[PDB]
Amino acid sequence: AYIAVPAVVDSRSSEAIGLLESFGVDAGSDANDVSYQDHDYVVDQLQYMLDGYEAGDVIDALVYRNWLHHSVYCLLPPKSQLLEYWKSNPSVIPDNVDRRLRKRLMLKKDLRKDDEYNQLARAFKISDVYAPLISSTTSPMTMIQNLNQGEIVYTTTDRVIGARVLLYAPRKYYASVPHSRFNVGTFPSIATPKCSVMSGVDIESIPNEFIKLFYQRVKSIHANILNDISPQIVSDMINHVDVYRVDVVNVLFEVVDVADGLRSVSRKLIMHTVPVCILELLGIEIADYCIRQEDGMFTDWFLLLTMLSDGLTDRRTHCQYLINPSSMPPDVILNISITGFINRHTIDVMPDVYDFIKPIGAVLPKGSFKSTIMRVLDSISVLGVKIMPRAHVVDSDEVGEQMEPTFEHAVMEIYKGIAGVDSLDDLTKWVLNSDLVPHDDRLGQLFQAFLPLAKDLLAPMARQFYDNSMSEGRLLTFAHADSELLNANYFGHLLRLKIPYITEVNLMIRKNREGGELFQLVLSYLYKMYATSAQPKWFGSLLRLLICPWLHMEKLIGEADPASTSAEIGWHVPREQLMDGFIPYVSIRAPRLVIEELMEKNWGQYHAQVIVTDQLVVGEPRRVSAKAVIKGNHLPVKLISRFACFTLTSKYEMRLPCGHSTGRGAAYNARLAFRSDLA
Amino acid sequence: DEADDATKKQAKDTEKAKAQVTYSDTGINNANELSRSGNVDNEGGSNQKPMSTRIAEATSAIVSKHPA
Amino acid sequence: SSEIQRHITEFISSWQNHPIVQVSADVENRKTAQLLHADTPRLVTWDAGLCTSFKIVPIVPAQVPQDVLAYTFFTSSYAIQSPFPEAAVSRIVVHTRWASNVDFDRDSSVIMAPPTENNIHLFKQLLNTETLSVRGANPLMFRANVLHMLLEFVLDNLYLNRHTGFSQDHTPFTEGANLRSLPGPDAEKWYSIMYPTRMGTPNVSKICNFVASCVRNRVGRFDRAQMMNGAMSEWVDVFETSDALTVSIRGRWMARLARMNINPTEIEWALTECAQGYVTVTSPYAPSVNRLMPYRISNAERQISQIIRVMNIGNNATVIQPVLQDISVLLQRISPLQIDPTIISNTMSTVSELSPASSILGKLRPSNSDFSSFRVALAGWLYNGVVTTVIDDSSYPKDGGSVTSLENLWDFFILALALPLTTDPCAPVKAFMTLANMMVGFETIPMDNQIYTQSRRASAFSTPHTWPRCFMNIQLISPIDAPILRQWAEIIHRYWPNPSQIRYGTPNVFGSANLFTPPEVLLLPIDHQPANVTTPTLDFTNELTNWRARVCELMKNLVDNQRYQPGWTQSLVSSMRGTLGKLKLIKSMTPMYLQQLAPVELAVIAPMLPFPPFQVPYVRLDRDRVPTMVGVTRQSRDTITQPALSLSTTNTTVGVPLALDARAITVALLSGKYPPDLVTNVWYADAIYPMYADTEVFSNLQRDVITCEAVQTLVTLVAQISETQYPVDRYLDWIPSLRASAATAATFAEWVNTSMKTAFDLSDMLLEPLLSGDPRMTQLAIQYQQYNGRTFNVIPEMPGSVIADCVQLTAEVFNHEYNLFGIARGDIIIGRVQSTHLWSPLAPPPDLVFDRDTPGVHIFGRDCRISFGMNGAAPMIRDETGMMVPFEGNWIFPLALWQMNTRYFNQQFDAWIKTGELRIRIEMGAYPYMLHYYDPRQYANAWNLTSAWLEEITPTSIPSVPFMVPISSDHDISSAPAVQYIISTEYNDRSLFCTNSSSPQTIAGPDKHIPVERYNILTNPDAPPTQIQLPEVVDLYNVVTRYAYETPPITAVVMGVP
Amino acid sequence: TQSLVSSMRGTLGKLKLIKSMTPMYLQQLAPVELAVIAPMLPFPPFQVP
Amino acid sequence: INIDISACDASITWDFFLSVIMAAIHEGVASSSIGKPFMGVPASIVNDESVVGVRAARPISGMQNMIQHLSKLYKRGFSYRVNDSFSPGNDFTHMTTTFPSGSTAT
Amino acid sequence: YLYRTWYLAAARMAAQPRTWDPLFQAIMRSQYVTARGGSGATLRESLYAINVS
Ligand SMILES: O=c1ccn([C@@H]2O[C@H](COP(=O)(O)OP(=O)(O)OP(=O)(O)O)[C@@H](O)[C@H]2O)c(=O)[nH]1
C-alpha cells in the first residue's frame, strides 16, 4: 500500500515527529509497519527541475511514478572524459562498443594524433552503447516510464527527478530499502490500484508551496480517479524537540440565541487555525458556551481564542465576518456552540521576516483592543520568565502625548481651516452624516489639513522618540498606521496587524476620551486614510509566536533543575572601570543539552557602546539603568537555535549588589558574553 | 507485486543484478488479470471489517438485559 | 444619547448590508487560464452509508415509570434496542446525509432542527439583506428561498451507492438473511435502524404491532452479480431503510453517468484513428471487472461549450495569443523541417558583376525575428473565425514603390510570396495594390473614388467594400496603358492557391466541436496531397512553386525594359534577370513540406488540443463569399421568442487581427530543408508518441458536461420565478413571492452559480458569460454573414439535464410533502377558543374555519379607513364594498394590509381579539410554523405567544407562527381549560409520525399509529419489491442497488507500446 | 492600416445590448417622483411648451 | 517651459507609485507566461482573494514570483549601512523609503 | 491611467517571443555582473542567518 500526505516525509525524522498524530491519525501503538519514504531529495529535484522545464510537464510526469518500485539513475561524464575513462582502467568496457574502438583503446600509444581514431571517436555516440539513455532534451515522461520499468537508468545530465543520482566514473572525470505494507510519503501517484491520498487538509493551508503546487495541479486534473481517505479511515486501516512548530485546527461553531428555552441557530462560522495547545489548555470541547459572562464584555478566553488565530468567515457566504464588539442589535453574539474540528496540520510559527534580534513595531487600527490585550498579555509568565512585561511595550499614544500642545489637541483646532465650522461638534456633524461612513469629499477637505500636522510635527517628534526608545533596550511599539513608522524612520521589524472585530464600534463604546466619541472616530478615519494600503495580516500571527513556544517548552523543562536549564546573554564590562556587571539583553530557557551547546558558541564578535548611569529604579532589586547601541552587526537568530525559548523584549539596566555607591556613569565599549551558572 | 518479486527472485537465482527472463513489463497488455487478495471475503464482499467483528456486531445489536 | 445609539444601530445595519459576490477587478488573465486549462469537475463520489434524507426524531419523552402500567411492560426496562424512538410524540424532520459515510463532501446540506425549535433562518438566506430582525423573514422571498433549498437538497446527494460486505445472520430473528455491515466507529447501532423487521414482538405496543404486521423475507441482500470468484461482487440489491426520493435521485445520477461510459477497445480505436497510424496503443482482451469511466458526450454539448469559449475569447487577442504560441512550440517539437537561409546565399553567390545579390537576406531582414512567425501563421489556419493573421504595416515599401528602385522590387517580391499564407480575405487585393502603388507615374488604372486613389497604401485596404472595380473587371485595365498591371491581375485570378482539407479527428469517443463546417474536417488555405514515399527527395510540382515561378516571370517582364528603369545599365539588367532566373529554381523543400507533411501534423495535433479549431470557409477570390462578421447571442430582444428571429439583432461580433512578418515568412519559404537521412515513419512515430500519453482532453469533456448542466439548471430555476420563453411546469405558485426585476434575477442566478461551483469542486468561471447580461430570457446561438448578405446560423439543441430534472422532481414531491420541510400551507384564523377539548391546532375542526364564500363575512382589501367612535359609540373600519362595520364578527385580511399598518392595527384591534369577539383570517398562503407542547392537565393560555407574533409583524418581515399543541397520553387524565388563539385552516399534521410509540394505545390527545403507507413493501404482501408511490409518499423503506465499479485512469488500461 | 471594424463592431454591440435599468427608470418612476415633489416646492414649476 | 521634479527618488514609494506599478506588471505578464520560468526563477504558487467570496490557490509564473519578492522588498523600504571614515564612531544603520539610485531599473 | 499604461506595456513586453530564449535570459543575467561593488558582505552574513554555506 501507499499513502500520500501534504508534508515533506522523511525516513529519519518523520518517524520521530511521527506526522500521523500530526495530521490526526491514531497510529500510536506498536505499529512499526507504517514505513516512511525519502522525499527530501525529490522535493529538491522538483525545485531544481522547475528551473528549466515547465511546471505542467514536470508535475504530470512525476505523478506517474511507482514509488514502491526501487530504481536509480547514474549519470555518465561527457564523451571525451568518458573515452578517457574507457582507456585508463579499460577492463570495464561494455561489449556493445565497436570492435575497432575497443581494439584501438586497448593500445598503449600516446594517442596524440591517431588519424583513424579521431574519425572513430567522431562517429561514436553515447546513445547506441547504453540502451536506456535519457537525454539532454528528454522531454520528461520517458524518464518516469524508464524508472517504472527497470532497475538502472543512464543519464547524461543532472536535471532528473524520481530517484537518486549515482556516479559512474570516479570524481576526477566530473566538474565540481525494504517495504512495510503501509508505505507513506508526499507526492501522490496513480501508478497502482493501491495508491491513496489522505484528504482532510485544505489546499490553501499547505505550507511548503512546492507540495502545494503539486497538489493543486494534480487535483485539478485527476480529481475523479484519485482515492481519498480521511484520517479516521487511515487509522482504521492501520489498526532535540523543535519548538515553533505547533499543531493548528479550526473550530466549527454557530451562534445561538437561547431566550426563554427556545434554541435558534442563527449563523455558522469557522475560526481558521487556532493552535491545538490553547484549546487543550482552556478545556474546549463540543458544548454550549457564553462568551460574555458579565456586563457585555467578552469572557476573554474567547478573546484569547479570537486573538490567537486567523479570522472567522461565514459558511453560507464564503466571506470574512468580523464579529460585533458591542452589545447592541441587529447582531450580537452572546451564546455559541462548538460543533467540530476540521483540518489539522503543523505550521512554522517563526515568521521569515524575523531573522535578526531587533525591536518590533506592531501597527494596529485605532479602535482595537490594545489596552485589554496588554492587560491580558502582561500576566503570562510561564517558567518565571514574564514573557511580555507591561514596561517593555510602548503605548500607541505615547509619541503624541509628549508635546506641549499634544497631537490630538493640535488636531482638535483643525476646524479653523475649514470654510466654516465654528466648533468641534459642527465639524463632527459636517463630516459623517447620521451614521458613520462620512462624506468622502468633506473627509478629503479635512484630510488636506490633517496631513501637514502629521508630516511636520508628528514625524519629526517620532524620529527622535523612537531613537531614544531604541537606545534603552528592545521594546514592542504600537502605532495607528504604517506611515507613522515609515516617515519617522523606524528601525526594527514592521509588522502590520489586524483584529477580527469591527473596530469602529469601540470608538462609540468607550466613554472618557479627549473630544467626543465622534471626534475619536473621525480621527481614526484620518489615520486609516493615511495608511498606504498593504495587507494587515491577522494580529494573531504575532501572539501565536509570543505564547505558543513557551507552552511547549514548559512540558520539556517543567520539572528539571532551574540552574541546569537557564541562561542569560548580555553586554560585559571588566571588573575594572568602576571609576563585573553586565546588562542582560536576553534570557534563554531551554533543556540542559542545548544549554551545553550554546555555552560554546562565539557570542563575542558583537560589540556595542554601553553608557551606564547612576540613576536608581523604584523596582525591588537594586539596579541602575543603562543604555546600549549595537555596532557593526545584529545578533542573528540562528545562534539561539530553534530549540530554545528566548524573550523578544528587554530593558537595559545593571544591578549593583556590592559596595553600594553609584559613581559618575560612563561609556565602556562592552562585548557580548554568554552568562549561565555551572549547570 | 508478485511479478516484480518473481523477477527479483530470478535475478538473485541467476546471480545477476538485471534479470533476463522476466514476468512483468512484458509485451502483452495483461491489464484485466486478477489475483487472490485479502480484500475480498467469500460472499464477494469487501474485507475491511473482518467477518468475526461483523458477526459480533450484528449479534450484539439484538441482545437484551435484566429489568431493574 | 438615544439619538446616538440610533446612529450606532444604523451604522451596524449599513455594515451588515455589504455585498456578497462582486467582481470589480479585471478578468483577462483568468480568461486566458480558463481557456488553456480548465478545472475538472468532481463527478464520481461514493457513499458507503445508507441512502436517506429523512430522520425520525422524538419530540417529547414517554413516561416509563407511571402509575397505571407497571414498568415491566415497556421494552426500555430491558434495554431492547428498537428501530424507532420510544417517545410520546415523534416527528419526522429533514437532514441530508445524517447516515452517510461519504468519500467526498459537497458542502451542501439541508439540515433542520425539529419543529419545536426555530427554523426561520433557513428562509431568510437569499434576499433578506434588509431584514433587521434576527427572528423575522420577508414573505415575498419565500419561494425563491425554497427553490434554493431544493437545489441544495438535490446537489447534496449526487453520490454513488457503495458496496460494503455482508454477514450470515447467526440468530433466529431472521431466516439466515444477509446483513450489510457499514463502516464507522460505532456500527452496532445501525443494525437496528436498517432493519425494522428484525426484532422480537413481545408487547402489544405500537412498535410491536407494526413489526408484527410486516413481512418476514424482505430483509438484507436478495440479488447479486458474481462474475469472477474471489473478486468483488459487481452490484447487489438490498432491502434497508432508505427513501424513494433520494433513491430516485441517485438512480437518475447513475443512469446519466452510465450513459457516458466508454471501454478500452473503443478508446484504443479512437486514439489510433487520431494519431493516424503513427502511434500504436494496446488494450486487453479477456473478461474484466466492470470499470466505469464517464467520458463520452454528445455533439450539442461540445458545440455549446465551443460557443461559450468563443464568446469569452471574443475581441481581445490577448486571450488568443498564447494558444497560437503553444501550437507554435508543439510544431517545434514535432515537425522535421528546419530552415536554412544559407540556401539563398548559395544560390545568389554565383552572379558576376546597386547589386541584386545583396538585398533580401543580408540586408532586408528584421535581425531579431527568427522563424516563429512562420509557424504562428501556420497555427493561425485553425482559427480563422476569431483570429485573422495579416501582414504587418511595417513590411510595406514605405509610402510608394517606385519600380525604378531596387529595394522596392525586392520588397514587392517578398510581399507577393508571403501574402498567400495569411488568413485574411483581402490578401489578393493587397497583393495587387502593392504593385499598383509601386507603378505610379508609369501605368495608371481607374479607381472607385478620389479617397482610395492609386497612390494609397496597399495596407489601408482590406475590407471587401474596398476592392477596386478595375480589379473585378479586367477589361478596365487597358492592355496598352497598363500591360504589367493587366498581366499581374490575371495572374492573381488564375494561379492563386486553392483551398483544401485534411479530415482529422474521430467523433466516436470525442464529440465534434465543429460549428460552421461538417464534423471531422479541417479547412486549409492550400492544396493537400499525400506523400508516396518516406525518404523524401526534392520535387517542383506544387502550388507554391508554381506561384513563385509566376511571380518571377512577371518580374522578368517588368525588369527587362529600358522603359520603366531609365538609368539602369545593361549589366545591371542582365544581373537582375539572372538573379530572377536562379531564384525561380532555388532548391527549397518548404513548399513540398507545406503540401505533404504540414497538414498531416496539423490534423494530428488538432484532437489533442485544449481549444478546438474554429473555422469559417476559406473563400478564394470572390467578394460574395467573404465573411464580414461572426457573432454570438446570449439573450433575446423583445417579446419575440425564437432564436432564428432574434439572432440577427441580438448578436455580438467577435474576432481580432494579428500581425506577422513578411520577411520571416518569405525566408522560411525560400530556405527549407530536411535532415540528411530522414525516414518519415520513424521520425513521426518518435516525435508524436509523447503527446498521446496525457489524458487532459477527457477531463475537458467532463467539464463540457458540467457546463451544459449548469446552463439548463439556470434557465429552469430562473423561469420558476420570472416569466420566460421556455415551457416548464410550475408547482410552487402557492408560495408567496416577489415581482422580480433584472436585478433580483441576476442575484438569484448568482446564488445558483455559487452553489453549483461549491458542489463539483471547481474554482473558476461557470455561468459568468451568461450572468454578465440579463439572464431572464437567455439563449445560445452563433452566426456569420457573408458579403452579399447571406447569413449562416447554428442554434444548438439544448440536451436534457439530470440536475434540472431532479430539481423538478423534488419540487413535485414538495408540493405534497411540504410539512416535512417546515412549511405549512393555507391561511390562519385568529380569535380565542376556550374549551377543554384536545384537538390539535394543525388539524382543527371544520366548524371554526370560514372563507370568502361564507354568509356574513366581511372582506377588507385596499382603500380601507378607520374612524373613531365619539360619545361612546363603536369605532368603525371601512369594508371593501364601502360599508363601515364595528370591531366584531369574523373578517378577512390580506397579509400586506396588516404589514403596512402593523402598529396602527395592533393598538386598535388587540384588545378586541383578546377579550372581544373579533376573529381575523390572515391570508398568507405559506408560512413556517413553530410548535409549543403543553401538559393538558393544567391551565394553558396562548395570548403571550400570539401577541408577540402580532406585535412582531413588520412591513418587511414576519416571525414563525406559534402553535400551542397538547401532549398525548396513554391513560386517563383529568381535563383542564386551554385557550387557543391561532389555528391553521387545513390539515398540516403530515409530519406527525407516531404518538406514544411504546404503549398499547393513545387515550387522550392527537392519536396516530405508525404510517403503514410509508413502509409499503413490508405491509403489503402483494406488492412488487420495486414499487414506489413517489409523488405522494416517500415510503421510508425500499430496495436500493449498490455498485462496486472501479474507476482506473485511462493510462493504466490502455498502454502505449513505446 | 489594420482592420478595426471587428473591434469597433463588437464594442458597439456591447454598448447596444448593455443592461441598464436607467431608461425604464426615467420612463416609469421619474415622472411619478417629479409629480410627487412638485406641489411641495417653494418656487413651483414654471414651464414653457 | 522648464519642468523638474524636486527629490525624485524620495517621491516614488509604495503608497502611490510602486503599488500600482507592481499590480500592473503582475497582471499584464499573466497571459503570455502561464507556466514558464524566467531568469532562473521557478514557477511558484500563491493564493488570491481578488474576487469577493472566492479564495483559491492559483499558480503563477516565474516573472510573477519575482514581482512577489520585489513587492515584499519595496513594501518595507530600504536599510542603509552607513560607515563614514570622516567621523570615528559612526557605523549606524538607517532605513528609508527613498527609491534607490543604484538599481538597473532606476 | 498609470495602471493602464504599465499593464499594456507589461503585456506587450511579455508577448514578444524574443524574451523567451536562453540567450536573452543570459544577457539580462550578465547585464549587472560587473567589477564594481555590490555590498557582498551583508549578502553573505544574511545568507549565513539561515544556515547556508
Ligand atoms: O548621485 C546621484 C544623482 C542622481 N542620479 C540619478 O538621477 C535621478 C534623480 O536624481 P536626484 O533625485 O538626486 O535629483 P534631485 O532630486 O536632487 O533634484 P533637485 O531636488 O536638486 O532639484 C535618480 O534616480 C538617480 O538614480 C544618480 O545616478 N547619481
Side-chain angles (χ1 to χ4, degrees), chain E residues 4-10 12 99-103 106:
Chain E
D4 293 331
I5 298 169
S6 65
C8 182
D9 291 333
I12 297 170
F99 183 78
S101 66
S103 178
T106 301

Side-chain angles (χ1 to χ4, degrees), chain C residues 219 286 321 515 581 615 668 696 704 727 753 854 869 999:
Chain C
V219 176
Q321 185 68 40
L515 294 174
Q615 292 180 355
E696 181 179 359
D704 290 332
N753 186 1
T854 300
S999 298

Side-chain angles (χ1 to χ4, degrees), chain A residues 50-51 209 318 489 492 631-632, chain E residues 37 40 44-45 76 81 91 95:
Chain A
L50 292 175
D51 186 73
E209 190 270 329
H318 296 284
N489 297 113
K631 299 293 184 182
Chain E
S44 294
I45 191 168
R76 179 65 179 88
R81 186 179 296 276
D91 62 356
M95 296 182 73

Side-chain angles (χ1 to χ4, degrees), chain C residues 229-252:
Chain C
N229 62 2
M232 293 297 291
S233 178
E234 294 299 329
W235 61 269
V236 296
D237 290 331
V238 297
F239 293 107
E240 66 185 2
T241 300
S242 65
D243 61 356
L245 194 153
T246 195
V247 174
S248 298
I249 295 172
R250 293 182 182 179
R252 301 290 182 88

Side-chain angles (χ1 to χ4, degrees), chain A residues 221 224 228 264 316 331 434, chain C residues 10 43 103 118 152 702:
Chain A
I221 296 170
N224 292 316
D228 290 331
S264 300
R316 178 71 274 172
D331 285 350
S434 297
Chain C
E10 293 179 355
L43 294 175
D103 184 73
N118 193 357
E152 287 180 352
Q702 293 179 356

